[PDB]
């Protein structure tokens, strides 16, 4: 049993016709203090998987080392390490899920919420969640922390069920994700303007975008708001 110290906020994600998109901001909070402003919380594994992590950052860095080691281990005595016997999204997830549940079972959890996004060998979209309790679930859209409350409602208007996935393009999907990140910046007190985004497509592969910023923000209306009720000046 511990308490999380340096923490990361929401991770958000969704499926689209030819793949999956995932995003998370670059902040490492220390309670209410916005301590570290250059933290990468999306961690790619090969050219077919991206693991998004929220919660305790020391535990995140531990998980990051486990994944790095997993790649090294898979390559051992494996001539098809960059082909048929490469690491799949499903393999990477199941491994993490095993660890998370084992650690909670010893009453010493990795204080995180994790989303594994990727594309499988047969082109199928992979998107699944796991957290400190070892709880897992999949959905056309997945989000952690505040994202669960604010992002999912917006992303579910694009892809409400399974049959909406082929009808959703990558342009429409990215547009929805970027908007969700703006909304989280308006409303989450432990978020930052700077974020990273990752697309995994079955055709065009893995596109990793860094140093993105929330833009097109509405603040002008603030000038007209005066007092808390009766005040006119």
């Amino acid at each position: 049993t511990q308490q999380p110290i340096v923490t990361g906020t929401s991770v958000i994600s969704m499926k689209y016709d030819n793949g999956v998109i995932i995003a998370a901001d670059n902040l490492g909070s220390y309670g209410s203090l916005l301590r570290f402003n250059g933290v990468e919380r999306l961690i790619p594994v090969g050219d077919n998987t991206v693991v998004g992590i929220s919660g305790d950052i020391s535990d995140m860095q531990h998980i990051e080392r486990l994944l790095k080691d997993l790649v090294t281990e898979n390559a051992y005595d494996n001539p098809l390490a960059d082909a048929e016997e490469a690491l799949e999204p499903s393999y990477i997830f199941e491994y993490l899920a095993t660890v998370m549940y084992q650690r909670r079972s010893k009453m010493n959890p990795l204080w995180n919420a994790i989303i594994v996004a990727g594309v499988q060998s047969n082109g199928d979209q992979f998107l699944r969640y796991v957290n400190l309790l070892g709880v897992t679930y999949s959905s056309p859209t997945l989000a952690t922390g505040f994202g669960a409350h604010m992002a999912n409602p917006l992303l579910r208007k694009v892809v409400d069920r399974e049959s909406d996935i082929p009808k959703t393009t990558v342009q429409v999907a990215e547009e929805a994700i970027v908007n969700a990140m703006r909304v989280l910046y308006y409303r989450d007190a432990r978020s930052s303007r700077n974020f990273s985004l990752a697309i995994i497509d079955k055709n065009t592969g893995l596109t990793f975008k860094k140093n993105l910023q929330v833009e097109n923000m509405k603040w002008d209306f603030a000038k007209d708001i005066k007092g808390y009720g009766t005040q006119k000046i």
Binding site: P153, L154, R156, N179, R187, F221, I225, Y228, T230
Partner: protein, 226 residues
């Protein structure tokens, strides 16, 4: 509970879902959360149901007497002031979280109220357990200079977001439009996107199915003549 308030060109609109819950159970499927303080001042309430009702009735009652005393149509700021001072006095124990809207001789107004007695001003507001789902929609689609039609659409869409994504909210969408120089139109069950499907089977029993011990006529009438 999901309740919203949206300002527009010539007035203000408020909306609400119709779900009430006791823990994980739904107590009422078609609950009425839009309350009338005065003819053109309405408010939506979240939190403890008895408190939102009671605190609305009391201030609404005193507002009516005040209107009669002053020979003036009531103002939203008066309802706001009386509500906040009452809630502050009770130090948050009266669990009423209100969005107060209305039109009056000063113009159209939109305010929020919290249980401890703090008030806020805005063009768009949301309260309750589904306020985050609703505020996501409002922050995505809200603009300045909304029409009446556009504001109703935005308000209901913000409630729908609560209905579908928040387990504390559900069933139907109630709306109340308050335009300047017009009567306030209260649209009860403006949307009904949760009708139950026909059941597979009828559970009407054959008469005599239940075992009875005694029968007797109950005297509801008064004492009779002669």
């Amino acid at each position: 509970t999901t309740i919203v308030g949206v300002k527009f060109n010539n007035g203000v609109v408020i909306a609400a879902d119709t779900r009430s819950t006791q823990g994980p159970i739904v107590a009422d499927k078609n609950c009425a959360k839009l309350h009338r303080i005065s003819p053109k001042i309405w408010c939506a309430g979240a939190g403890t149901a008895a408190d939102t009702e009671a605190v609305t009735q009391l201030i609404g009652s005193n507002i009516e007497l005040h209107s009669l005393y002053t020979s003036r149509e009531p103002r939203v700021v008066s309802a706001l002031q009386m509500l906040k001072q009452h809630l502050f006095k009770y130090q948050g124990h009266i669990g009423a979280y209100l969005i107060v809207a209305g039109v009056d001789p000063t113009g159209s107004h939109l305010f929020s109220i919290h249980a401890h007695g703090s008030t806020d001003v805005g063009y768009y507001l949301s309260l309750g357990s589904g306020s985050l789902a609703a505020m996501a929609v409002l922050e995505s689609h809200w603009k300045q200079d909304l029409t009446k039609e556009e504001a109703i659409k935005l308000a209901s869409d913000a409630i729908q977001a609560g209905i579908w994504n928040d387990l504390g909210s559900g069933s139907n969408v109630d709306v109340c439009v308050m335009e300047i120089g017009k009567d306030a139109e209260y649209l009860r069950n403006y949307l009904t996107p949760n009708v139950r499907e026909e059941k597979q089977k009828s559970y009407k029993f054959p008469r005599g199915t239940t075992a009875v011990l005694k029968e007797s006529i109950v005297n509801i009438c008064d004492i009779q003549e002669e």
